[PDB]
From a paper:
EF-Tu is one of the most critical proteins in bacteria, as it is the only protein delivering aminoacyl-tRNA to the ribosome for polypeptide synthesis. EF-Ts functions as a guanine nucleotide exchange factor and catalyzes the reaction of EF-Tu from the inactive form (GDP-bound) to the active form (GTP-bound). The Mtb EF-Tu contains three domains, named Domain I (residues 1–200), II (residues 213–296), and III (residues 306–396). Here, we report the crystal structures of Mtb EF-Tu•EF-Ts and EF-Tu•GDP complexes, showing the molecular basis of EF-Tu’s representative recycling and inactive forms in protein translation.
The final structure contains four EF-Tu molecules per asymmetric unit. Each EF-Tu molecule was bound with a GDP and an Mg2+ ion. The GDP molecule was bound with Domain I of EF-Tu, which consisted of five loops, named G-1 to G-5, similar to other nucleotide-binding proteins. G-1 was referred to as the P-loop due to the conserved amino acid sequence like GX4GK(ST) from residues G19 to K25, which connected the β1 strand and α1 helix responsible for phosphate binding. Also, residues K25, T26, and T27, located on the α1 helix, forming hydrogen bonds with the α- and β-phosphate of GDP. Especially, residue D83 was bound with the Mg2+ ion through several water molecules. Also, residues D141 and A176 formed hydrogen bonds with the guanine ring of GDP. The GDP molecule interacted with residues D22, G24, K25, T26, T27, N138, D141, and A176 of EF-Tu, which were conserved in Mtb, E. coli, and T. thermophilus. Moreover, analyzing the electrostatic potential surface showed that GDP was bound in the pocket full of positive charges. D22, G24, K25, T26, T27, A176, and D141 of EF-Tu shifted from 2.8 Å to 5.5 Å upon conformational change, which could explain how EF-Ts help EF-Tu to dissociate with GDP and reactivate EF-Tu during the elongation cycle of protein translation.
Numbering used by the authors: 10 to 396
Write the structure that this text describes.
């Protein structure tokens, strides 16, 4: 019964919210287990979400098929999709592209799929909507060519399936189009690959602080993001200071217990053999040995907080010196703007190149904040690393 994060993406007036309403409905009349059929009113008039200091407008919805339980996310505004995806309100494990068969792919449709590659969304599949209105069959055929050629150039594939649906007629109970969105949810079931168990990910916990206890005890604290660790297994601290450390954890303890295994998500304290207190910093990470290494230069995709959200006032140029909150620490780096971009306004999303004065353990698809002395001015995700 795996849990999966998906969402509808596409142009405005193309019927993303309708299909989301149809999807939840089609499974609620067809399942006692599936949650309340949500109506267009409460999905379209989406609530307001504030995460990491950024304001969003996101509609969360849950439903489950017989193969997976899903966590669906929809937004009203296009910019909200820019916000959500880059700032991770939906660490999406799949995505449903919505292409209205009347218009076809529009700038956002390309912009959404493009941005899907920037944040590492593994799969995108297509829901050819509004087929209740298109007479011509060979027009529909071509509408599939433009898309499948949009998804092919953005490193996706022919493997991804296009499903002609009607988000309206299925929503209105028409058994011919109700079955159409039914096939979608089976494609959704099989096409999107199974998202890895956060337990089965390789071990990773960011360091939060460090103290001296007993005589030989130098505890490190943090909440495990990835994986689990067995007591006395070698770990690897990763580069707030320039070097790469290596030590064998000798005791893990959560609250009253002193476990031999800490799970992903647990607030845990790790006692270590072979380093002292002055060898560990916030933002350092205790990885499984050799799984991850710390880089210094990378290529990211960042969203800048706008005037209305308390974002930066002056636009910034190359050789911009902010801090980058990679995990539990603010590391200062310098910017180079992409060829063609001379200035970054508030509001603007952009690709970006960054050189850090520090080394930081990082992988692609890692959220980070951009701050002016603690005050966050933006956020983003790693897209490409260099050196
Ligand atoms: N005929 C038809 N109209 C649709 C369909 N899906 C959505 N619409 C229309 O599209 C309009 C906006 O739908 P909505 O889901 O809010 O679009 P989005 O949120 O921008 O993706 C509504 O007035 C619907 O009547 C469909 O499958 N068939
Ligand atoms: Mg919408």
């Amino acid at each position: 019964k795996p849990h999966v994060n998906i969402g509808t993406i596409g142009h405005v007036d193309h019927g993303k919210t309708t299909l989301t309403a149809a999807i939840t409905k089609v499974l609620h009349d067809k399942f006692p287990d599936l949650n309340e059929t949500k109506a267009f009113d409460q999905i379209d008039n989406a609530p307001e979400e504030r995460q990491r200091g950024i304001t969003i407008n996101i509609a969360h919805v849950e439903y489950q098929t017989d193969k997976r339980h899903y966590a669906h996310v929809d937004a009203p505004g296009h910019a909200d999709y820019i916000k959500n995806m880059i700032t991770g309100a939906a660490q999406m494990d799949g995505a449903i592209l919505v292409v209205a068969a009347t218009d076809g792919p529009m700038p956002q449709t390309r912009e959404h799929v493009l941005l899907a590659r920037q944040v590492g969304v593994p799969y995108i599949l297509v829901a050819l909507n509004k087929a209740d209105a298109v007479d011509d069959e060979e027009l529909l055929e071509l509408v599939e060519m433009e898309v499948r050629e949009l998804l092919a150039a953005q490193e996706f594939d022919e493997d991804a399936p296009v499903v002609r649906v009607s988000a309206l007629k299925a929503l209105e109970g028409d058994a011919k189009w109700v079955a159409s969105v039914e096939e979608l949810m089976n494609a959704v079931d099989e096409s999107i690959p199974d998202p890895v168990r956060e337990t089965d990910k390789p071990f990773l916990m960011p360091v939060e602080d460090v103290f001296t206890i007993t005589g030989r005890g130098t505890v490190v604290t943090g909440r495990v993001e990835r994986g689990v660790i067995n007591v006395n297994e070698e770990v690897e601290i990763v580069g707030i200071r320039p070097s790469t450390t290596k030590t064998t954890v000798t005791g893990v303890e959560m609250f009253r217990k002193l476990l031999d295994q800490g799970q992903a998500g647990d607030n845990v304290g790790l006692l270590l053999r072979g380093v002292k207190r002055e060898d560990v910093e916030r933002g350092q990470v205790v990885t499984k040995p050799g799984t991850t290494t710390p880089h210094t230069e990378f290529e990211g995709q960042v969203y800048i907080l706008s005037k209305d959200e308390g974002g930066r006032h002056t636009p910034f140029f190359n050789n911009y010196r902010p801090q980058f909150y990679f995990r539990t620490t603010d590391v200062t780096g310098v910017v180079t703007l992409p060829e063609g971009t001379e200035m970054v306004m508030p509001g603007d999303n952009t690709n970006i190149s960054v050189k850090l004065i520090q080394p930081v353990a990082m992988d692609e698809g890692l959220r980070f904040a951009i701050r002016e002395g603690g005050r966050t001015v933006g956020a983003g995700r790693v897209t490409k690393i260099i050196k």
